[PDB]
Amino acid sequence: QKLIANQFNSAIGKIQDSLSSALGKLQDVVNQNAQALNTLVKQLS
Amino acid sequence: LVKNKCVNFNFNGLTGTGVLTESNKKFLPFQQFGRDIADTTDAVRDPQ
Ligand SMILES: *[C@@H]1O[C@H](CO)[C@@H](O)[C@H](O)[C@H]1NC(C)=O
């Protein structure tokens, strides 16, 4: 139990570290929404 | 000038409709109006 809990606590620390660097799947939805609206307004010219 | 009302305007040949209010931003001395990333006009300089 001690070893298992230590491995778990250590692994959560590596997630927290890695996320302080991966979100491309969320970011590119935000980008595509904005890029489509900017295209729609530019197209009025 | 008529600030803070929806007005129809003509600044020195640049025309539109909108509400005019004093800006925090400042242009270079030769620049006459501002545009945003979409190329809509977001600010203007009063010629008087
Ligand atoms: C325009 O004329 C007014 C009235 O004399 C004066 O207060 C103002 O400073 C002048 N502005 C320019 C840009 O000449």
Contact B12, B47 (CB under 8 A): yes
Residues of A in contact with B35 (CB under 8 A): none
Q: Distances from the Cα of B22 to the Cαs of A22, A44, B11, B38, in angstroms?
A: 42, 28, 15, 22
Residue with tokens 């295209």: A39
User: How many angstroms separate the alpha carbon of residue B47 from the centre of ligand 1?
Assistant: 9
Q: Collapsing DSSP states into helix, strand and coil, what is residue B4?
A: coil
Contact, B36 vs B27, CB < 8 A? Answer: no
Q: Is residue B9 within 8 Å of residue B17, measured between CB atoms? A: yes
With an 8 Å Cβ cutoff, are A38 and B38 in contact?
yes
DSSP state of A24: H
The beta strands (E) that lie in chain B are given as 6-11, 14-19, 33-35, 41-44
Chain B positions touching A41 (Cβ under 8 A) are: 38, 40
**Interval between CA B48 and ligand 1 midpoint (Å):** 6
Strand partners of residue B10: B15
Give me the resolution in angstroms, 1 decimal.
Answer: 2.4
- Taking the centre of ligand 1 as the mean of its atom positions, its distance from the CA of residue B46, in whole angstroms, is 11
CA–CA separation, B12 vs B32, rounded Å? Answer: 9
